[PDB]
């Protein structure tokens, strides 16, 4: 009755397309689903990956009974670095789930973090496993096609009900390593009731289904095959299926694959050796291919975190340190723009082609297919679990709308479809569905240095120069009182005012003066009537330092 | 043989969608094609709008023969109120030619700018007209169906051959107003010879054909009759066509439609004025509508310059000061988003269904169409005119460049294409056809208070700060030196380094007094070394500003 409810809490993933981590619980014990980070967008210089404030984990820490990880994309564990041992320190008796690959990715990312090996309790499962974790969770995960091998879904079995999640997926028919998705237990869970889904909700405004990882690969064998010179082909890290059909691809024309970027090198060495990834001769280095004749080489790229913009913006402006871009170059983007860094592909490809590169790159070639299910894939996954609840998941606002509406317009809508927020907790029970509260929540910065050396403060004031300028008033606090005010970034208009901001500060510092205050109350009595002034007198709402020295 | 060339200089419109305007010269007389604007992107806030540079222009004044004006889109003609005044002044005697409609907008424009009524020369012709220009040119322009009416393309005659410019087009077989496309002075271009062709890029990615205006019109009848209350809708202004469709499905519903945006409100009067708009009732205020029930209601709005993303974002946001969002609405964005402008769109949308709004927008929803031709009607007209050499114009390079590779397959392709640029000077002879220099070219900005208001170093030294932050060093140059240092958006791990950059700073300011060095030369002796420092020990170049004062 009373104290049979499961809580949700998303802490990140909800309403955007990113740093996936999801919070379950009944009564005292918990149990956390994947921990992933998020990439930058341009814009953000010196942000080299953002991660989930965990503050609920890091209170609740002894009521953890489990980590589960779908699958090893970035967005998915790539937080899991910074997140254990920010929540359990340097090491933890809790127990990690995830699949061979999952688990073998995570690894090569805690070593390369200080973590000693061993310091965590990863426990290797299949993609299909049944684990029962604590008193109240029975956890049977299946099989999903996706991005990455090794991907999952998860039913939740609970004391008030099953919760379907279908962690990320598409319905690929002809999946690259021949390993389809197992529905049964999806199915079952329907046929038995399902209370809650859960469901990715990336292309559900797409009708149709999306291609196949074959389609892809076949096109790239195509493009590749018709190649002059050169091949160059970025995507993800962690995109394991997409990189197999890129090598695919270069051997059967007789090109060797050389590869650069130290995340991909990373994951590819790892799938190589637990078998993921097959390669006739092996992979090469820049140099080790540099005196190759231009069609026998294909280089596959990424930036240094996995994700490809960086490599692609330096091909295009700053200039890399390895590689250059020549005519004749064939360049594929073989993966989809970060949100948000949509246009500033535009701008590489733009700059690519100047360059003199015959540049491939999606939606408008064929050379790259979504990891997510379309409208038809996720109309079969509601008709499977026609659940009571629902709660569309992976993808911002306008995404998760479209799946409700998409939800509603089924044989038997869901009773209620609830738009999930991060830092929202939502309580359910056998008969209700609802958000009864919140949580501190939000994102924490990561570059070279670790976490804090940028933050939200840091960010908020580079907006307000960049898009209202700076005005510094330099103030002398004596008996010969001196003002001086410049300004950059600031509209004509009001530079030409810096004169009346410069005697008004005068007055200010001179009655300061006479009344003996504390210079900070005099750097108020001129950043205030300042600021007031300017913008009544230009709309505009530039930062103003007052700098007031007593001398 | 030598004298005989024709210069083409572009000034605007290359290599970008927006401010078209394009020069063209034999010997000593001179024509213009268009003068259009741009829309700045946000992200470039206090900017209203930006025009071409047309220092050659106002140099070569005299050899000023015509200005000619292909249609009333704002990238079209919307930079005339600003351009005319540069070249000729507050009057000109030079003939600047244009149908009904778009010189109908242009005079609206430049009344509302204080140009007297008959300050300029406007000859209106016909969308089919042929004038002769000069000694040297004779323009035969010809009717295109495009997203406003009265919208042509002209085949330029010149002393060393055909210039085809299709101008904006698509080949719309069933137009709103019953217009269609003349392609008779094109194809006999095509069959005498044409040595350039210069045409619409703005869709040379995509395969097919542009859908209808009429599927739009049908689809928003659609959508607008299913609507369970009000209904905003928003476009650009000058989009004649979409908004006749508009009303026609407001009024099939028994909606009255009420009109918000100066610019929009002011075109559709010219429009209903000269008879391209027709209404049932009439075109209300939203003052004359808020008081009528909700199903009866549909708004059409844009924002003050004409574009509808600053009216979007204060329904979202900021909050607009005569209407508000609210639960049961449906909003539908009838237009794309300008370059640039595409992901900002994507958090509006995402914000307008957070306030309860039923959004529909493309590519997801049918409500729009582009106003471009797609490669079936491009091929069409590269067969109609095979011409000799090619400059593909109005897009991004990657957008020219498509259209380059769409040529090359062609069954006759050019002799050789060139990518434009503006400011580029190409020479044109009858057997050649190459960049041969360069012209000042560039962009001003403009703002409620003019041009020069808003400034490229203004905003060079926005992104410096935007992307590295600021650095304030205070010296007080005396026998009592003093150095505080302060800074905002800047990494912590630089601003750790404060204290040493106060030191070394104190050092510069006291060895600078030593000298008896002025003090702009106290503040290089800052400036460099400190910047030197920073950079050297955390990589980022954050602004530094130092001040010194004596005293
Ligand atoms: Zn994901
Ligand atoms: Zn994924
Ligand atoms: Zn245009
Ligand atoms: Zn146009």
Same mark, same amino acid.
């Given at each position: 009755?009373?104290?049979?409810?499961?809580?949700?809490?998303?802490?990140?993933?909800?309403?955007?397309?990113?740093?996936?981590?999801?919070?379950?619980?009944?009564?005292?014990?918990?149990?956390?689903?994947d921990g992933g980070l998020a990439f930058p967008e341009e814009g953000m210089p010196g942000v080299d990956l953002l991660i989930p404030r965990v503050d609920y984990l890091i209170e609740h820490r002894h009521k953890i009974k489990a980590w589960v990880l779908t %699958?090893?994309?970035?967005?998915?564990?790539? *937080?899991?670095?910074?997140? @254990?041992?920010? +929540?359990?320190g340097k090491e933890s008796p809790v127990p990690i789930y995830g699949a061979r690959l999952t688990l073998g990715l995570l690894r090569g990312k805690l070593e390369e973090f200080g973590l000693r090996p061993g310091a965590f309790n990863?426990?290797?499962?299949?993609?299909?496993?049944?684990?029962?974790?604590?008193?109240?969770?029975?956890?049977?995960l299946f099989r999903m096609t996706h991005s990455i091998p090794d991907n999952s879904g998860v039913v939740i079995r609970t004391p008030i009900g099953?919760?379907?999640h279908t962690g990320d997926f598409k319905l690929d028919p002809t999946p690259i390593?021949?390993?389809?998705? %197992?529905?049964?237990?999806?199915?079952?869970? *329907?046929?038995?009731?399902? @209370?809650?889904? +859960?469901?990715?909700?990336?292309?559900?405004?797409?009708?149709?289904?999306?291609?196949?990882?074959?389609?892809?690969?076949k096109e790239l064998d195509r493009v590749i095959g018709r190649a002059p010179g050169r091949v160059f082909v970025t995507t993800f890290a962690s995109h394991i299926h997409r990189i197999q059909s890129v090598i695919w691809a270069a051997e059967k024309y007789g090109r060797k694959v050389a590869m650069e970027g130290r995340s991909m090198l990373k994951f590819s060495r790892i799938a190589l050796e637990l078998g993921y990834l097959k390669v006739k001769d092996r992979l090469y280095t820049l140099e080790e291919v540099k005196d190759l004749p231009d069609h026998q080489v294909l280089i596959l790229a990424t930036g240094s975190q996995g994700q490809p913009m960086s490599v692609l913006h330096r091909l295009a402006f700053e200039g890399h340190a390895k590689m250059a871009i020549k005519p004749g170059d064939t360049v594929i983007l073989?993966?989809?723009?970060?949100?948000?860094?949509?246009?500033?592909?535009?701008?590489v490809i733009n700059r690519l082609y100047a360059l003199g590169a015959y540049v491939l790159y999606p939606p408008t070639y064929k050379v790259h297919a979504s990891g997510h299910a379309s409208q038809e894939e996720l109309k079969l996954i509601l008709n499977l679990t026609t659940p009571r609840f629902?709660?569309?998941?992976?993808?911002?606002?306008?995404?998760?709308?479209?799946?409700?509406?998409?939800?509603?317009?089924?044989?038997?809508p869901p009773e209620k479809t609830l738009i999930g927020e991060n830092g929202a907790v939502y309580r359910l029970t056998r008969e209700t569905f609802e958000?009864?509260?919140?949580?501190?929540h939000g994102v924490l910065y990561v570059d070279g240095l670790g976490v804090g050396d940028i933050t939200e403060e840091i960010l908020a004031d580079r907006r307000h120069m960049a898009e209202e300028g700076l005005v510094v008033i330099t103030a002398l606090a004596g008996e010969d009182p001196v003002v001086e005010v410049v300004s950059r970034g600031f509209v004509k208009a009001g530079e030409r005012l810096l004169g009346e901001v410069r005697r008004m500060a005068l007055e200010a510092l001179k009655n300061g003066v006479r009344e003996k205050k504390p210079l900070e109350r005099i750097r108020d009595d001129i950043y205030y009537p300042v600021k007031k002034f300017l913008k009544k007198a230009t709309g505009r709402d530039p930062m103003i330092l007052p700098v007031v020295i007593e001398g």
């Open positions: 009755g009373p104290q049979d409810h499961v809580e949700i809490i998303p802490l990140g993933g909800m309403g955007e397309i990113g740093k996936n981590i999801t919070v379950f619980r009944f009564r005292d014990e918990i149990f956390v689903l %699958h090893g994309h970035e967005d998915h564990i790539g *937080g899991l670095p910074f997140l @254990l041992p920010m +929540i359990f990863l426990k290797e499962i299949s993609p299909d496993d049944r684990i029962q974790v604590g008193r109240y969770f029975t956890l049977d099953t919760i379907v390593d021949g390993k389809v998705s %197992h529905l049964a237990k999806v199915a079952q869970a *329907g046929a038995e009731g399902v @209370l809650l889904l +859960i469901a990715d909700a990336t292309n559900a405004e797409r009708p149709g289904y999306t291609p196949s990882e074959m389609e892809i690969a073989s993966s989809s723009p970060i949100p948000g860094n949509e246009e500033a592909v535009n701008r629902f709660l569309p998941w992976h993808g911002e606002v306008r995404h998760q709308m479209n799946f409700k509406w998409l939800a509603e317009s089924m044989s038997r958000k009864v509260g919140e949580v501190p």
